[model samples]
Target: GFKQDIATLRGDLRTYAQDIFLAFLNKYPDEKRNFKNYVGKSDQELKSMAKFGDHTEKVFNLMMEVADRATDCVPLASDASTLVQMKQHSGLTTGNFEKLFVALVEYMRASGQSFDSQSWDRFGKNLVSALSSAGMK
Candidate 1:
């Protein structure tokens, strides 16, 4: 269950931001602009920001929620709502959206999760299809 998956991360908020920036944001200039406010902040400082930490937790929870209900669209609609908010507020684009899973997949693997697991593969594909149907890409 996703509860076990979620537990794997424990509460390491700083590592999440570190991985996100290094593994995702830093590689894409246009997408990196989404965090223009964090431009000069150190990794520790960025993680210390209440809003940033909260946002990270929220997205993590949402992803696990989707994973838990992998066979249903109702929970995915909830995720789409948050994605819309992200686009409206952060200039998220379809290109960025597609690229995001690369970072996510990496993070999952690095956390000792097997990419070759059929259940994991299906869950990931289902999410991509759901995002596409939401008019993302």
Candidate 2:
């Protein structure tokens, strides 16, 4: 079922979040200072921090919702909603969005999860369109 995927991913949520964060920082070295307080923190430590953990949970939940409602339709409200939340709250940027995908893909690979690349690409496309619509460059 759809929830099963979220359940499986949630099992390793802490580690997954850590991997994604590290991957993001490593991929964009300059971005590290943007989250300087998180530097050198353990996964457990990061997981315990509200700014990291809570925010990640919200983003993940939004993504799951997007997954559930995905379709051939363009300009999904869910997509726009998630992107607006991301831009407004997560400090997400157009340049960093692709890096975030790289982090997510790598995390999925490490988790031994079988990801649907086409679906992922479509999701990204929709997100990009939403971001553009939301006035992100």
Candidate 3:
């Protein structure tokens, strides 16, 4: 069975941000101009805005939508055979899949191609090849 946990997903999101931090630093080269940190802080602060607070229920609604989508998107194994199939087909365990997916998702989000499936395929291939070339250790 393959499933994703929100806590783990959040960690991966953090890692994704960390991975890009260096490049982001290189491009801007200043904390004052550091877009990544700026955007991260802005995203965090946006929640505290009084005008936005009126939309608090919108956050709950969105969270519910997210929960529903996650429940439907990530399926579980029915038996041993399906589990073996998942293990073989993914070339990574469920936990690893979660991490890899998080990386890909974050990359896509940053690259501005979130809904683009082809971008995902390319990102996934690069991820697989990177892992495979390392002998999948």
Candidate 4:
């Protein structure tokens, strides 16, 4: 059951990743330069793995990984302008994102879903805008 569920979750994560990438591309549609410049290697890496993984664990890992990625650099920190962009893009209401995040955590804990760094790395980059200096000092 766990494996089966996770396999399903992997598909969901791919959907999420595709949506995020498509949104970015829609906002900056240019295959060669703008998209190339806008999308870093990390983003490419995420896209590569969007279709495979343990679904449940990947979902759990994605939640943490994306959140961590959102705040990973100086420019994307909680106080960073990227937070504004993230909020606007997700169109999430106050506490809605939090509630969803907590709900996923609860599911992970209850179902005992597990994930690893590579999975998180792939899924996280897909879910959030990232750069090495995004939230760094």
Candidate 5:
């Protein structure tokens, strides 16, 4: 169920990289300082940025793979290693990181994609747990 939503999201959320990142940046605009290379880029310019655009795809694609490989929602080796580096790289505190995914959730909601509770848990709490295990605190 979770995997299927992800698949639909992949199909439907193709614009997510730009759309979601811009949404996140708007919610926490100061975090833009972390993306120095994109500092001067307009919102439109940022959308065209390969570096910025590619990052979201990696995260979601990796999440899909992780979900596929999981028997349980247990964190696996490097399952969230990205978050460890990203926390430092983006300078987002734990709360900010959680908000990042909440941005994604809101996107799904606004985009009219309904999901079940299990999928919601896996999408939110389970990944938040991985962030905890990733040593963000």
Candidate 6:
């Protein structure tokens, strides 16, 4: 299990949540365009803005919430959808999150943190399936 792995991953992976988001923004330019204030800045400059920081926390914070319920895809999907679809997070599709944890493992690969990326990949897969069956695109 996923249940077992999520417990281990959440505590450790959560530490890299912010770093992963920054790396994610670098890897995907289109995502960066979503944040109007962050559009024309370097990674370091975006780091200083409260606006960017808030979105980072909220995004990963949703991960924390979903991890707590990883045992059930129904609740996990609903949990993620609830916050992620809010007006505050507008223009960000579920795929961004579906693609997110990969960047975390990339950072971990170089930092010698040694994550078994399959855990979150599996989690992400379940989420995508769950989201689709629930009528989300």
RMSD of each: 4.1, 3.6, 15.7, 13.1, 3.3, 3.3
> Model 5: runs farther than 4 Å from truth?
70-78, 81-93, 116-118
What are the models' TM-scores?
A: 0.63, 0.69, 0.24, 0.29, 0.72, 0.75
Which residue pairs overlap in candidate 3's backbone? Answer: none
List candidate 1 segments past 4 Å from native.
1-4, 10-22, 72-82, 85-90, 112-125
Candidate 5 lDDT over residue span 6-37, tens digit each: 56657845475568767777777777776778
What does candidate 4's lDDT look like per residue over 46-136, in tens digits?
4554232233244345443434444321123442334334532343332333333333433444443453323333333333333222431
lDDT agreement of model 3 with the native: 0.38
lDDT of 6 at 44: 74
Best by TM-score: 6
> Residue 89 error for model 6, in Å?
4.1
- Candidate 2, residue 37: the lDDT equals 71
Q: Write the per-residue lDDT of candidate 6 for residues 64-116, one digit (tens) a residue.
A: 66866777433465765675456755655567766665675566566754455
On residues 61-120, what C-alpha lDDT tens digit does candidate 3 reach at each position? 432233333333422222222333434344443334334444444544666423443434
Find the 10 residues in a row with the least total lDDT in model 4: 71-80
- The alpha-carbon deviation from the true structure for residue 6 of candidate 5, after best TM-score superposition, in angstroms, is 1.0
Consecutive 10-residue window with the lowest summed lDDT within model 1: 114-123
Tens-digit per-residue lDDT, 1-137, candidate 2: 33455566567765665567667666667765667677787657777777887767666666666656666423476577657665454665666666666666665556656655445555666666777677666
Between candidates 2 and 6, the one scoring higher on TM-score is: 6
